[model samples]
Target: SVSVWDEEEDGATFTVTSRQYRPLDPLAPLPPPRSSRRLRAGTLEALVRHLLDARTAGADMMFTPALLATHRAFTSTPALFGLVADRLEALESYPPGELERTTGVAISVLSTWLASHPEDFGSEVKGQLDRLESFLLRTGYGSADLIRNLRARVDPPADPTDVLVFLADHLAEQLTLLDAELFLNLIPSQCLGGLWGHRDRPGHSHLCPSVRATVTQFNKVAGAVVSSVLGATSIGEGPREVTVRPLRPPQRARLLEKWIRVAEECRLLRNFSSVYAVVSALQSSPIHRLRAAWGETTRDSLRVFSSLCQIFGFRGGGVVPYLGTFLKDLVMLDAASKDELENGYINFDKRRKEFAILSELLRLQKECRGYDLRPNSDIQQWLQGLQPLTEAQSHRVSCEVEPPG
Candidate 1:
């Protein structure tokens, strides 16, 4: 055991030992006493030993007054800048709630420490700051202060892929948070009756009002995507020979293919709404009319796309098959929960089944929530540049299939 100086309560200095050393101890012979000027040398020695033993035996390690005093006497310079950076990086993987609180504390401590040692930090300190800023920006946890501090230090993404995925995630998160009751209440009678477009319930022409509004916004986003791709593909409205296009046919094909890939990735993430929007854009008459361009789609991709369309469409029954399966399962569980044939006793299995299904729904909703976005000028510019056609414009433009040159 090594001796660390504890706080001096009297004129005498007493030493305390730790058990983090060579094994096998029976309290060895006492060393020669120090200056007798020290009062209660034996009493203080015993008390110090007891405290160290208790601390080694797993006592709470709060930063209490005595602990801090002892730490001040022994340890020098509590340099925590490196640890703060590490903590922020770890904060990325953890979901919000406790994770956010912990990161906030880390950042707070770092800022306080930095404020104290303004001139002490050098180039290396700036590097650590850059790392922390990058982690925060990448994980969408950057605060206004941190952003303003690192505004010129950070660089924007060169590719649009990250921005597109980020937007998709943000949209899915918002949609999942929409009040289910509100959406249900807004459903038109015709939509509720399982006969889409039919006047099954009179005086109701607006179909799924809430859903329509949400999906309409989604369509606008999809329109932007389509317009961006088309803009990259075609020459301006002028003579073919003199017209200028940003990208050639091959490059445009590759770009469209990448967007399709991104859409599939979104699907794999279980963001079905975003997938639906992407499908709407891809299947729009103008884009769909380019048969040669679609040749870039692989057979496997086509199969996946077809399956997604089926799941979204009301083919087998009036409702979408994917959601229908979950709803039907929930109904079965509910029916079983009501059965009283078994001695009129309560059935826990039915309740368990219902709980399990509800848990899945809740999990889906949770994953679709808590999307925080960092501001990016490039993303804003790109979105602004797109000029997606409106429903009227799309319908007015005839589907004229153009042959490949």
Candidate 2:
């Protein structure tokens, strides 16, 4: 980073600065920022330090929580890329003394991005990669080792596509295991009642990201159950695969009973999260009316059904304990009481309850880590693949499966 200045008065001046050393393209056509609009003060500075220390300093293959959080931040707003680029475009505006420090960090920040989130550079990311590279090559890091490694690692247009013919399943083991993985990954703060109270605000996407994700997944699981039973029992080749078909009563009972058994397994696993989804989905409107189907179901299944639907356990251990219930309790408690007592004093009692709820959530989160599970990609993919239907759609489908008497 040494610069040689040819000056008359200053003899043999070596201006040591990273500005001279760093590879940057201030002149390159980086896009304008989108929703990010502008970079908040010191945001990139913090971003740069964490990135450099985490991956830029050494090698990290697994996606650590630190990097995962960053990854989530970046992916959440695609506009952030333009924001970074625009900042780099104006690097010359910085004071000369600050030039060296800013340039090195900015370049390092850009280069280290692809490493921490390699596969994250999917379809849209590939566009950012090429555009940045086109400008990045004009900068000092054009020949850098990590830069080349990153560029080379990007699978050339020949992406290895999987020709997966549909086939899948999720027993209690698979359901609970997947649920634990999600529970383990959830950010406890995201579930805070204060944040959720503002959950309906415009552009509140960032407010409760993890909370919303888990809830959506939970909804999907329930949706999957209703559609599955209807699909398996009602859907037939009636009228040359007409838009609708008829129902199979005994088959419906067997499948319904099977889900009860799955919930029973969840109870045994102490994974109430999955148990809640299973039992709740079974109790959904359309499914509960299948009286003929219920009569055919076995006695053992009936006993398990009552047990799975039991409120005493929830009137609530090692189990996941239906996080939905806990979240509702937190939200309800927050609303029922004022933030402070009469004179605007801080309420430790209110805070204490919130702390207890959050602490318990954290406790459960840690215990989930010991589920002793490894992700089965096939089952995971299948679980996520089910298309959830709307109430109207399910109602229509239910009728198609079983004609009115």
Best by lDDT: 2
lDDT of 1 at 396: 32
In candidate 1, list every pair of residues with a backbone clash.
Answer: none
- State in Å the error of residue 329, model 1: 14
Candidate 1 lDDT over residue span 1-405, tens digit each? 344444344322233433344334548654533321111122222222322232322332221112212211112223234445665576577777656665565555444434432322445455666676677668666366644544333222122323344444443333322322222223222121122323236864553354355445566557655655554222234223111134445555664665566566555445555566777677877677765666755667677667766766111111111233454565455555442223432232333344455445444444434323234554455554544555444433323224335
lDDT of 1 at 230: 54
TM of each candidate vs. truth: 0.33, 0.53
Q: List the candidate 1 regions with Cα displacement exceeding 4 Å.
A: 1-210, 232-248, 296-367, 370-377, 395-405
Top-TM-score candidate index:
2
